[PDB]
Every structure is written in structure tokens, then in C-alpha cells.
Design a protein around this ligand. Structure first.
Ligand SMILES: C[C@]12CCC(=O)C[C@H]1CC[C@@H]1[C@@H]2CC[C@]2(C)C(=O)CC[C@@H]12
Lengths: 219, 218
């Protein structure tokens, strides 16, 4: 199938340069355009421009003439977006999207790359267990989780049991404290009978700080 | 610089009802070549956008028949008939007739459903956290509708002001409910000055408020 896999989240000081990559597979790379789209936090989608892999030429929307560039590495079927002289307005999620030129539309999109522009250094989270509400030998369902506390910037990724536990998970939006750092919780509900036998681990990954943590949560 | 106006900004719709999203262009989207390059995307919470409709009225692959587009010239509609929980998200029209391509501002489709009461849970600080010098207490309201909910913290039966933070998920894409965390953050010293910790929840689903509590070191 068609897949567009983008590189990971970035933190950069104002004035620096960032290069974002989008690896394509599952189709003839040069025969479709590559579009870049910006989405600032809470805001709508903005078409930045596209590069034509067949001729190597770029075209930009008016707001993106100047500090922006698209590159290609055709043998590695990868497209890049470079932004130089970074500003605060550039903090956003950036999507590559394949252009199916037969109808002038973007058809498949990448998962997005978050870029934060900031003067502050990264700060990795501390992870604390939120211990099961009930004992194994009582009825109904129990809730358990992980507090992912005091990190910068967003995003953090939380999974349970390395993706094997998916049902009943709620990972909350990060919130800022007066300290200027984010915290969030991820929680899951499980049959309380399974607490006796099943083990629950939350895997936290904060890539900008190279923090990976696996916390066992039990009674 | 054509503007793409998309109305409404948010559209509440019940399950099984029809939803209508309007998108308006300041100039005709008919290309001198005869085609109309108006498209629709949906972005579900957390996800990248997904291609839905191309050239006004054609469904992209795998898109259910309950989605249809219509309109001509400057006025376009997207209709979602018999709405499903999975349909939740922000819908964007997108034009590529005129240079440069533009999106509309998006319309957030939200599901109306019956009131559902929260399940409430409280979590004491972990010891790992305490021995790092702080204490967060976490109250969880799980799977409720509507979004409006009141959470009050009482510490030895005194009401707390402005030392907690709320966070709410997006509507669940299966049952259209929300969940919410309330977090009370105290310094370890302050935390150990008190014995009983409680959140009280008020909500349309509960006939009267529900309190969950623990006694420090229980
Ligand atoms: C440049 C252009 C080239 C062909 C044309 O005359 C229209 C423009 C504007 C729309 C563009 C298109 C090529 C492919 C693009 C970039 C897409 O894949 C989405 C919008 C499309």
C-alpha cells in the first residue's frame, strides 16, 4: 500500500534551520507530486507548496516564499522540507501529502511532524504509576495509569504493554503548569480480576529529550 | 487570493441524523478546462487528514456511500447521511482550481447522544513521586456525556481553589463519550499536612454528586 512516513518531533532555537523528512513507499515516487501542509496548534490546515519529483521544480504559496525549501532524494524515495531562520510562528505540525495529479488532489498523507521553536532546552518527563483502584478479588472494572510529569516540549508518546493493550485507554491532552512545563496522564480500565495475572506497563517516549521509560503499574 | 468560507464552525448532529456542511468560495471553482477542483478531507482527532471526496461529488476509495458532495460554481455542500460515531472530526474543503490551493477553515462535527454518567476514580500520589518532593492527586471521570462536569477537591473537607488542572479527551469514536482528569498538585510538605483527600463530581447523569476519597497512607 501507499505509505508516507515522516521523521520525528523537533525542538529548535529561533534563527536555526530544520530539515524534515518524508519517506515514501508503495508507489512510483517520481510520478506523483509531494505537497507540504502546515497546521499550527488548534488552527486550520495551510497548503505550503509542492515539489514535482519528475522535473525537480518547486512552487510555494505566498506565505511560504523565502525561508522555505523542498528537496528530494529520489533513489531513497524521500522528500524533505527545510525551514531556515526559524521563528515562533513556525511552531506547528507539518504534513507531507502525495499529490495524485490526475485529479489535482492530495490523496495519502504522512502522520505529521511536530516542530517547536523555542529559546528553552528540552526537559524529559518523570513517570509515576497511578495504582489500580481496586483489589484483584473484587468485582467489575479497575482503572490504572501513568502520570507523565514536567516535560518540554510536546509531544510525548504513551503506549500500554508495547501496543498490545489498546482497548479502554485514555491518554489525556497535555496541560501546562505555572512552571512552564507540560504534564499528562494516560489511564486504562481493565477487568479487576485480571490484576492478579496480567501485568501492565506504560511505555513513555519523549523523543526531543531521548527519554524512553517503561513503568510497571501494579497494586 | 480567493477566500474559502466554510460554515458552520461546529455542527452538533445526532446518531443516524443527516449533517450538512457548506463551503463557499469568493470566486467560481470551475477551471477554464471545464473541471471543478473542489475536494473534502476529514481529520479525526489525533490523526492526519484523510481524503474523502474529489471533484465535488466522487468518493475516494473505501469512503462509505453515506458521504456525498454536491454544488457548483461557488457553493458546495458535503452531506453525511445517517451519522455514525466514527464520523466525528474536522471536515475541510480544499480547492485547487486557482493558484494557490486553499483549505476552508474546517467544521468540527460533534455527536449528540444521550446523557451518560461518569465512573469516578481517585489516585493517591506514588511513593516514587513523594520521594522526589511533590504530590499529585488524580481524579478520573470516565466515559460521560455531556462535556460539562464539575469537579471539586476537598482536602480534610475544605474546598480547594486554583491548585488543580483539568484535561478532557476528544469524543470517543465508538460511544461518543468524554473522559476527564482533574489533577491536584501540592508540595510534599503540604500534602502531608492533611489526612483525607476527596474529589466530588457533579454531572447531568448523576442524580446527586459522587465523592471518591482516600486517607493518606491507605
Ligand atoms: C500546480 C498545479 C499544476 C497544474 C495546474 O495548472 C494547476 C496547479 C495548481 C494545483 C496543483 C497543480 C499540480 C498538482 C498539485 C500541487 C496537487 O497535487 C494539489 C494541487 C495541485
Amino acid at each position: 500500500q501507499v505509505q508516507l512516513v515522516q521523521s520525528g518531533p523537533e525542538l529548535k532555537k529561533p534563527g536555526e534551520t530544520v530539515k524534515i523528512s518524508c519517506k515514501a513507499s508503495g508507489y512510483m515516487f517520481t510520478n506523483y507530486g509531494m505537497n507540504w501542509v502546515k497546521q499550527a496548534p488548534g488552527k486550520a490546515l495551510k497548503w505550503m507548496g509542492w515539489i514535482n519529483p519528475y522535473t525537480g521544480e518547486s512552487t510555494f504559496a505566498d506565505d511560504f516564499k523565502g525561508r522555505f525549501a523542498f528537496f528530494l532524494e529520489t533513489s531513497a524515495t524521500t522528500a524533505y522540507l527545510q525551514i531556515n531562520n526559524l521563528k515562533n510562528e513556525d511552531t506547528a505540525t507539518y504534513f507531507c501529502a502525495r499529490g495524485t495529479t490526475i485529479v489535482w488532489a492530495m490523496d495519502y498523507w504522512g502522520q505529521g511532524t511536530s516542530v517547536t521553536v523555542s529559546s528553552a532546552s528540552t526537559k524529559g518527563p518523570s513517570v509515576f504509576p497511578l495504582a489500580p483502584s481496586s483489589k484483584s478479588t473484587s468485582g467489575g472494572t479497575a482503572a490504572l495509569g501513568c502520570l507523565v510529569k514536567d516535560y518540554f516540549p510536546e509531544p510525548v508518546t504513551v503506549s500500554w504493554n508495547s501496543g498490545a493493550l489498546t482497548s479502554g485507554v485514555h491518554t489525556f491532552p497535555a496541560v501546562l503548569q505555572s512552571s512552564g512545563l507540560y504534564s499528562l496522564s494516560s489511564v486504562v480500565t481493565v477487568p479487576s480480576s485480571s490484576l492478579g495475572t496480567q501485568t501492565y506497563i506504560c511505555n513513555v517516549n519523549h523523543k526531543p529529550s531521548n527519554t524512553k521509560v517503561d513503568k510497571k503499574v501494579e497494586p | 487570493e480567493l477566500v474559502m468560507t466554510q460554515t458552520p464552525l461546529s455542527l452538533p448532529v445526532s446518531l443516524g441524523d443527516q449533517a450538512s456542511i457548506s463551503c463557499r468560495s469568493s470566486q467560481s471553482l470551475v477551471h477554464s478546462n471545464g473541471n471543478t477542483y473542489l475536494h473534502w478531507y476529514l481529520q479525526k482527532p489525533g490523526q492526519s487528514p484523510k481524503f474523502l471526496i474529489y471533484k465535488v461529488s466522487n468518493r475516494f476509495s473505501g469512503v462509505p456511500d453515506r458521504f456525498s458532495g454536491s454544488g457548483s460554481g461557488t457553493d458546495f455542500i458535503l452531506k453525511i447521511s445517517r451519522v455514525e460515531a466514527e464520523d466525528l472530526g474536522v471536515y475541510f474543503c480544499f480547492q485547487s482550481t486557482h493558484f494557490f490551493p486553499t483549505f476552508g477553515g474546517g467544521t468540527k462535527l460533534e455527536i449528540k447522544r444521550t446523557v451518560a454518567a461518569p465512573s469516578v476514580f481517585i489516585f493517591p500520589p506514588s511513593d516514587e513521586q513523594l520521594k522526589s518532593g511533590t504530590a499529585s492527586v488524580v481524579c478520573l471521570l470516565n466515559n460521560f456525556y455531556p462535556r460539562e462536569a464539575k469537579v471539586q477537591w476537598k482536602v480534610d473537607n475544605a474546598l480547594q481553589s486554583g491548585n488543580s488542572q483539568e484535561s478532557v479527551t476528544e469524543q470517543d469514536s465508538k460511544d461518543s463519550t468524554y473522559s476527564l482528569s482533574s489533577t491536584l498538585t501540592l508540595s510534599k510538605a503540604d500534602y502531608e499536612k492533611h489526612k483525607v483527600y476527596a474529589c466530588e463530581v457533579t454531572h447531568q447523569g448523576l442524580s446527586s454528586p459522587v465523592t471518591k476519597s482516600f486517607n493518606r497512607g491507605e
